[PDB]
Amino acid sequence: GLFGAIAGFIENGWEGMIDGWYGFRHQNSEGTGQAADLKSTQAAIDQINGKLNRVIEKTNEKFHQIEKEFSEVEGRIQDLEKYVEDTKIDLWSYNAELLVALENQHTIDLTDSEMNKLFEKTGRQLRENAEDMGNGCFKIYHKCDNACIESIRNGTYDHDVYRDEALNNRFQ
Amino acid sequence: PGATLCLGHHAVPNGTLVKTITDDQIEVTNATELVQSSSTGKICNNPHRILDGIDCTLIDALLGDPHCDVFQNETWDLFVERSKAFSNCYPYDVPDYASLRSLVASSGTLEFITEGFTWTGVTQNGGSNACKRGPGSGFFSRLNWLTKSGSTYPVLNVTMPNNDNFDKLYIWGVHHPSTNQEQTSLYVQASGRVTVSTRRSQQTIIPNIGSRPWVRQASSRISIYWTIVKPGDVLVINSNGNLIAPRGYFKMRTGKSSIMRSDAPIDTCISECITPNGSIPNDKPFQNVNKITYGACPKYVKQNTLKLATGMRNVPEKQTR
Ligand SMILES: *[C@@H]1O[C@H](CO)[C@@H](O[C@@H]2O[C@H](CO)[C@@H](O[C@@H]3O[C@H](CO)[C@@H](O)[C@H](O)[C@@H]3O)[C@H](O)[C@H]2NC(C)=O)[C@H](O)[C@H]1NC(C)=O
Ligand SMILES: *[C@@H]1O[C@H](CO)[C@@H](O[C@@H]2O[C@H](CO)[C@@H](O[C@@H]3O[C@H](CO)[C@@H](O)[C@H](O)[C@@H]3O)[C@H](O)[C@H]2NC(C)=O)[C@H](O)[C@H]1NC(C)=O
Numbered sequence: 001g002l003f004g005a006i007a008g009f010i011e012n013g014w015e016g017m018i019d020g021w022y023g024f025r026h027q028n029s030e031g032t033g034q035a036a037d038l039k040s041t042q043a044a045i046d047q048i049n050g051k052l053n054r055v056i057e058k059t060n061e062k063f064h065q066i067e068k069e070f071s072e073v074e075g076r077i078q079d080l081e082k083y084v085e086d087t088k089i090d091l092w093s094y095n096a097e098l099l100v101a102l103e104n105q106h107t108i109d110l111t112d113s114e115m116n117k118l119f120e121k122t123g124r125q126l127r128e129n130a131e132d133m134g135n136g137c138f139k140i141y142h143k144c145d146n147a148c149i150e151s152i153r154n155g156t157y158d159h160d161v162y163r164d165e166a167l168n169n170r171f172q
Numbered sequence: 173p174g175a176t177l178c179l180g181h182h183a184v185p186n187g188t189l190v191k192t193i194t195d196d197q198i199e200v201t202n203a204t205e206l207v208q209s210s211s212t213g214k215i216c217n218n219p220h221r222i223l224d225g226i227d228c229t230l231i232d233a234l235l236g237d238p239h240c241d242v243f244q245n246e247t248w249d250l251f252v253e254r255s256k257a258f259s260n261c262y263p264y265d266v267p268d269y270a271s272l273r274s275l276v277a278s279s280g281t282l283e284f285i286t287e288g289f290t291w292t293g294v295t296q297n298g299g300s301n302a303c304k305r306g307p308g309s310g311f312f313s314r315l316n317w318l319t320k321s322g323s324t325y326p327v328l329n330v331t332m333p334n335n336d337n338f339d340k341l342y343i344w345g346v347h348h349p350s351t352n353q354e355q356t357s358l359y360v361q362a363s364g365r366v367t368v369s370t371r372r373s374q375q376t377i378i379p380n381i382g383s384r385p386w387v388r389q390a391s392s393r394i395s396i397y398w399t400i401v402k403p404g405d406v407l408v409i410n411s412n413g414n415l416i417a418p419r420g421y422f423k424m425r426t427g428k429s430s431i432m433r434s435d436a437p438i439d440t441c442i443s444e445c446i447t448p449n450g451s452i453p454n455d456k457p458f459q460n461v462n463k464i465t466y467g468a469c470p471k472y473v474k475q476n477t478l479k480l481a482t483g484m485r486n487v488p489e490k491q492t493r
């Protein structure tokens with residue numbers, strides 16, 4: 001995708017994450033764990049539902065039309081009837097092919113985008129108390145107990161609290 | 173001794189292949205089908221009024237072939253013609269059959285109003301063993317076969333004004349005898365003529381005498397014609413032989429009515445979209461069941477499947493086997 005996260009700097013996905021689309025894995029002194037990010041997950045899902053609902057929007061209802069199968073050879077009028085229908089079908093078949101190609105490219109790019117938004121947001125939250133390892137993982141340079149991890153994940157992590165500690169560990 | 177926090181995304185064990193701008197096949201976590209490719213094989217009886225033709229074409233029901241008498245005054249949203257249909261009356265053709273079938277199908281009714289035509293100096297209600305009604309000879313219910321009275325067939329000259337506020341459809345015909353003997357026996361004059369007109373149009377038909385292939389006991393034929401008479405206009409019919417006269421008019425309507433050729437059985441269910449293969453659901457935007465449809469239908473495309481991605485790129489862990 002355009003943002004280089006999914007199938008990019010993030011090596012692969014997590015089959016274990018069954019309660020969300022994007023999320024967090026951590027290691028600290030208390031062990032290791034996993035949690036889904038609801039907001040990113042919901043942003044992707046809402047966009048995908050949005051496009052799905054636009055695409056399946058019922059828009060055509062037709063009644064009496066032209067005949068499209070013929071039991072007799074007739075020539076000119078029938079040639080025209082068949083050509084009109086064949087023309088229509090090819091144009092609609094093209095529309096359908098193009099639609100799915102554009103939609104799917106965009107769905108891949110928007111999902112890649114949402115991964116990237118979460119990663120950049122997290123990075124910003126951590127300010128100077130962490131470093132980007134380059135594989136979607138932050139090395140956090142201080143004691144970050146489970147209350148501290150959950151603080152990062154639920155948007156309450158105050159970086160000032162841990163800054164002196166972390167700055168010291170980083171420039172040694 | 174610090175901590176690691178890794179950002180990631182889900183994956184699934186069984187992803188689906190989709191098409192994009194750059195890839196003809198690439199794997200995502202889920203997708204949904206946009207092409208309806210199946211039918212139940214049955215035509216749902218709601219919400220459209222379905223009239224099963226059974227043994228009858230719409231034209232045979234219109235003319236009043238005796239085995240189609242059950243269709244008198246019928247109405248429909250969709251008239252269904254079956255491949256088993258047959259004609260069993262006087263052999264006939266309709267120049268521009270397809271147009272008459274179309275305009276009647278689209279009108280959605282066979283409502284017929286009898287009018288008091290006065291046919292001075294001819295015998296009415298002619299019949300044939302080619303078109304039995306009960307045990308004896310008969311004819312199309314909506315047509316009146318006129319022949320000589322005594323030894324004469326005078327010039328027929330009649331009128332019917334349209335003083336209603338709706339259009340009238342008149343169905344009439346011309347008899348083509350197979351021999352000169354038949355021509356003169358029935359109509360006296362050696363050559364007939366039928367002229368049917370309104371203020372702005374006219375149709376004149378000259379009969380041709382000669383054998384056509386023997387069908388249901390006749391080498392003769394009737395050719396069927398039609399004339400629409402608008403409010404304030406008038407019908408005139410003028411003939412010195414061979415007229416197959418109208419008995420009245422059909423009431424024309426406009427609306428959503430049509431006709432379809434299908435052998436699918438009619439069943440109790442609800443479906444907006446009908447194809448000759450049967451009803452199909454209309455939740456998907458495209459379909460590959462049949463280019464012939466009626467109602468609120470997906471659009472026909474050539475593809476039998478098109479997958480809309482409903483999830484991210486599916487990236488499983490690098491496989492160790
Ligand atoms: C991933 O997308 C697929 C579509 O390709 C989803 O499958 C569909 O799931 C829905 C909801 O469970 C099914 O609708 C239900 O169908 C049953 C009939 O079996 C009906 O009784 C219910 O009222 C409802 O309409 C649908 O059948 C199913 N379609 C197919 C082709 O499998 C699937 O749910 C999605 N999964 C995830 C995790 O997003
Ligand atoms: C064959 O039958 C038609 C239908 O009745 C006859 O047409 C009618 O002919 C008369 C004249 O012979 C027309 O009368 C004229 O009407 C105008 C307008 O009202 C009036 O101002 C004139 O002084 C005159 O009386 C009549 O309108 C006409 N009607 C129609 C519906 O066409 C026709 O004459 C008959 N032909 C033969 C040879 O018998």
Ligand SMILES: *[C@@H]1O[C@H](CO)[C@@H](O[C@@H]2O[C@H](CO)[C@@H](O)[C@H](O)[C@H]2NC(C)=O)[C@H](O)[C@H]1NC(C)=O
Pocket residue numbers: 069209210211448449460461462
């Ligand atoms: C619906 O009916 C059509 C038309 O009867 C089917 O297509 C015909 O049958 C096979 C298709 O494999 C071919 O031999 C014919 O050439 C087809 N006819 C036409 C006019 O295309 C079609 O397969 C049916 N579809 C379903 C889902 O039942």
Ligand SMILES: *[C@@H]1O[C@H](CO)[C@@H](O)[C@H](O)[C@H]1NC(C)=O
Pocket residue numbers: 244245283284285
């Ligand atoms: C058909 O309808 C007309 C009026 O709409 C009526 O006069 C006629 O008798 C009806 N005939 C039958 C057979 O239902």
